[PDB]
Amino acid sequence: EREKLLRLEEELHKRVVGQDEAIRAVADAIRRARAGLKDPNRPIGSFLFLGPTGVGKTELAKTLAATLFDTEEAMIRIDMTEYMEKHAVSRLQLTEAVRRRPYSVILFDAIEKAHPDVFNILLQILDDGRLTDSHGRTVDFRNTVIILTSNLGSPLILEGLQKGWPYERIRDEVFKVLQQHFRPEFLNRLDEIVVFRPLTKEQIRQIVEIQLSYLRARLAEKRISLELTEAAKDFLAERGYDPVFGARPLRRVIQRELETPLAQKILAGEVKEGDRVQVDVGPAGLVFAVPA
């Protein structure tokens, strides 16, 4: 645990690009949680992830589960934007998932969409780190990490970055908005209020690179090298990212624009063993060239 918790920030960055502030806060919170500096009757760490979409939020939550609990199976997701009905009853489900896996990351999507009812169960987790289910026998959450997402501050967060005003002025301005949708008890029991930032076209390109890494590695098994032009990477970065969908299409795009054609070349034999595949942009996609 010691070694792991120290190298936490590295491990998280192996899969999550940028968002350094987020990583630090979470890591420090978890480190501060262990070592016994916090009320034992609390989750390991509770967080409010604010900012844009498809920028790392879910990715960080995923990676955290894997890096901290050795597997992505340690993630429990609550797509709150769906629990708009008999919510309360449909979770005492939550208790059960936690009941069988005490060490687990619990992700609540769009937390503002939750009805006051949920916040009580939620708040009961943040305090005393325990929960009374339907039957009665309470579930221990002391070994869980709670991550809550929301876009409440997003537009103002963005605005603060364009006008480029001090981070403090952003966080404060953003916090005010939060004080209008969340009960202070809630915001006060949060270990951290993390703000994710705008996946600059750069971060997208950076994701293109880390995305390419698996392809390189998978190809390396055939001694095959894969060099891409900045233009090519930029193109993937372009087609890959979406304002509303985030960096989700990237995978599908890289698959279709690069992997699909590359595959035809290998089966055809154009790309042999050890070949240094050069990839550059064309009229409406990518072009491949084997050096002579």
Q: What distance in Å separates the CA atoms of residue 198 and residue 160, rounded to the nearest whole number? A: 11
Extract long-range pairs of 236-245: CB within 8 Å, 24+ residues apart: 236/208, 237/201, 237/204, 237/205, 237/207, 237/208, 240/204, 240/207, 240/208, 241/54, 241/199, 241/201, 241/204, 242/54, 244/53, 245/53, 245/54
Q: Which residues are annotated as a binding site for ATP?
A: 51-58
Q: Which residues are annotated as a binding site?
A: 51-58
Q: What is the CATH number of the domain that holds 287?
A: 1.10.8.60
Domain boundary at 181, 198, 215, which?
198
Question: What count of other Cβ atoms lies within 10 Å of the Cβ of residue 250?
Answer: 21
Domain boundary at 166, 198, 230, which?
198
Token pair listed for 138: 């309470």
Q: Resolution of the coordinates in A?
A: 4.0
Rounded-to-5 percentages of helix, strand, coil across the chain: 50, 15, 35
Residue-range definition of the domain harbouring residue 231: 199-292
Using the CB atoms, write b or e for 171-191: b if 16+ within 10 Å. Answer: beebeebbeeebeeebeebbb
In the block, which residue shows the tokens 């990237």?
Answer: 250
Residue spans of beta strands (DSSP E) within 51-129: 75-78, 104-108
Are 36 and 136 contacting, i.e. CB atoms less than 8 angstroms apart? Answer: no
DSSP for 246-291 reads: BTSHHHHHHIIIIIHHHHHHHHHTSS-TT-EEEEEE-SSSEEEE--
